[model samples]
Target: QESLLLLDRIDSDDSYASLRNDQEFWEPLARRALEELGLPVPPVLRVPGESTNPVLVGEPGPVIKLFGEHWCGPESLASESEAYAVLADAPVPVPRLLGRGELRPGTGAWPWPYLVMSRMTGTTWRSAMDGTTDRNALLALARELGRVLGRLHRVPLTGNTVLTPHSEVFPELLRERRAATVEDHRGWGYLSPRLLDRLEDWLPDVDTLLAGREPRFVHGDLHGTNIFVDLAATEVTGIVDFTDVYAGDSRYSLVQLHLNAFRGDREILAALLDGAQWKRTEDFARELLAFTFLHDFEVFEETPLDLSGFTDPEELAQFLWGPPD
Candidate 1:
């Protein structure tokens, strides 16, 4: 409630309004987080690679990013970002939340929510996966991921209930898995009958994963894009993105990381499961694997025919029914 009021004030401030579209808005928040939360305040410069809300980077020091939305955006994910950062407080390598405010300079164009965060330093394990396989990078990413999952799964939820983890069974499946979901392949075709049949057979095995397993908090989405890697040093230095944080089995988190890190190889998949500390039941981990592969297939199924990418949808399908070594 206090935070909501603060957001309203930031949105009403004239100064915030004037600076809503300017890159200079990074200053005050950086100053505040460093002073109030002890987070890093790097030299201000525009961060690369994104701009829904403008981001500021602080290099040669702690990376501080400032993001703000344009227009009266109700979909702003920053508030949740701030709350998660606060709740996770220095746990694992989660980003430190410096502060948040809304753009109030202009009535129409500048209305939006914003967030300031301590920058996480590291290269990307995805980058390593794209080219040569780096065994060392994989190990580092797995270890850091395992440690973070341990923290989340053990962290208790505020309320007794939590939103269900998004599963492959969610919403619908592609034509490739017709048995499990409605078949629709507007651009491509739908899941083949055989593929759909196999998936439906696997349904009973996939649901209820959180029932008997040890429960904990989770980064609803902990795949490749969310993890930051320090490749030169061979480490997964920071874990970001907690919009999907929920109470569930931590093994699901591992399955997310492993899918991206291994690129669906049974050998690599086997390695990731073996590599992590043995904390969950084999049944639990296998269920995690089943959903991971199913979800991966859905992404490819949704891809447009005009798009040609690194991955082939057919290859993703193979892993779905493949035996787990």
Candidate 2:
């Protein structure tokens, strides 16, 4: 059947909660996508801990990722495909793009996009961090990411249409975020009414944040979930998933690391900054505070930084970012 029951489920209630747990539902979808491409249909191994998308390992060497209109749409597919194309010409340690195709539902519900990539084998950095108290290994991992990202951010945004530069959309996004900071954040979790009121006063009014900053390729999502590390060697072996990749602010990538991957650990974040050679003034913290709200993904309760500790947003911002150059 060319039908995906996934589309039908989305019509009822659009949530990953129902589908992700059901292997019977997604495994077949993975099979069909691979079969059409004449790839091997091996036993589908379920990936644990990922909140979005249905990911499966196809026995020996390929990883399959499924995206439906239910959770996200074609943009993710296009974005990831484009990012792989960029990596194809670069020296970065990411997966090689393999087969890609779409599954049109038998009921003509919608197109479900899927892609296969060369498998990356390593312990997830998050898993490693949780398992041991190896502080040195953790810092080495951060440094490796910094070195890798420093190389990635150097990729020039030349003639790329799919990944738009940050400057093009940032001003408008800033305006929208500025206009609705309190209202938008009230439901975003973690922020209290007091912190919400303080947010506006600390946000940058002048668009001087990105004045001389050039557009560079950003891995958009650099959290621990997407990173694979060699715990024994303390090296970053693989970085996967470019669905959220962009040609935006390079600093934006670091923000993702600090908040999500670094878990509000300023020392780890500092090592990354040092490795990447970031030069910022005292006001950079203020800029970061603005970007936190302006970020596409909101980490409500995931971050270890508590905003309530500091009376003023300025103090909180400085505490989060630390003393800038």
Candidate 3:
């Protein structure tokens, strides 16, 4: 009954609907995928995360990521393949694609495309962030991410364009939505009434600030969940989830790190820039904050949220990680 319920929700509000519906068929699909790639199928375990990509661990060993047309389109799969292919020989630790192909169509599950790749060995930075408060260690991790992200930027975006267009209208649309007098955003608990009011004044400035930026290779999603690190060694091991990788302003990539990992610390931001060798200015930093707000609003469209105490980027960071000491 739970399975049936999950399947029913797939077409409704649940984004993980496809995953739930597809789990039962994963074994047969895995067998075929391994056979297609000429690799022996080992023990398979479903790894869970908040992504459309269905990732499985195979013993002796390879990681399998499958994309069904239901939630994943060809464009996303193409971009991910492109990102991995380009970064294949990169100095940074990225998964090596062992094989890739689509399953045959017929068995109600054979049509999903799958990628067989090397599995990463380390704990996700998200897991490490559990009850962590060591400032020096956090700064060290920030610096490490800065270096890796800088390296990722260096991976030439030979042909990638604004796959996910960062346009002014996105911010405008959000402003229009928030401006509705009847709209209640107090429920989200991330935004404050004062901040909501301030958005009206700040939206235009944010628009102007982002208007002049250029695009580069950006890991569209760079949260702690996507970053892998070795806590004991205090070193970054790998970064995954290139599903949203695209050509965008480099600062755009830093937003999640600022919010989730850096905890709005300027010194950590400084450490990041130092490690990345990216020059920064006071003005650019200010714009980065504006972009962060702009991006958050853009993301809020898909997320069930409200503006409560999250009046500013720093405020939002605190809301997520607690108030600054």
TM-score of each: 0.60, 0.88, 0.74
- The most accurate candidate by TM-score is 2
Error of 3 at 220 (Å): 1.1
Which stretches of model 1 miss by more than 4 angstroms? 1-44, 50-79, 82-86, 105-110, 131-137, 158-191, 205-209, 232-234, 279-286, 293-325
CA shift at 16, candidate 2, in angstroms? 5.5
RMSD to true structure for each model, in Å = 8.3, 2.8, 5.7
Clashes of each: 10, 2, 8
**lDDT digits (tens) for residues 42-118 of candidate 1:** 55554444433445565654544343443323333633453364465445766776565554443654334445566
Model 2 spans > 4 angstroms off: 2-7, 12-17, 105-107, 164-175, 323-325
**What is the Cα-based TM-score of model 2?**
0.88
Which of candidates 1 and 2 is the stronger one according to TM-score? 2
Looking at model 2, the pairs that clash are: 2-106, 3-106
Q: Model 2, poorest ten-residue lDDT window?
A: 158-167
Q: What is candidate 3's lDDT per residue for 1-325, written digit by digit as tens?
A: 2323433343533555645335564656676678888988786555554556677776567878877556555556877877886676777878788998776642553356788888777788767766577767866876787788888876765544333344333345334443542134445444667776665565445346546766567776676677888766768888887776666667777767666555455676777777898786635655554555545333343322343445564455433323224
The CA lDDT of each predicted structure is: 0.48, 0.71, 0.63
Better by TM-score, candidate 3 or 1: 3
Alpha-carbon error at 219 in model 3, in Å? Answer: 0.3
**lDDT-best of 1 and 3:** 3
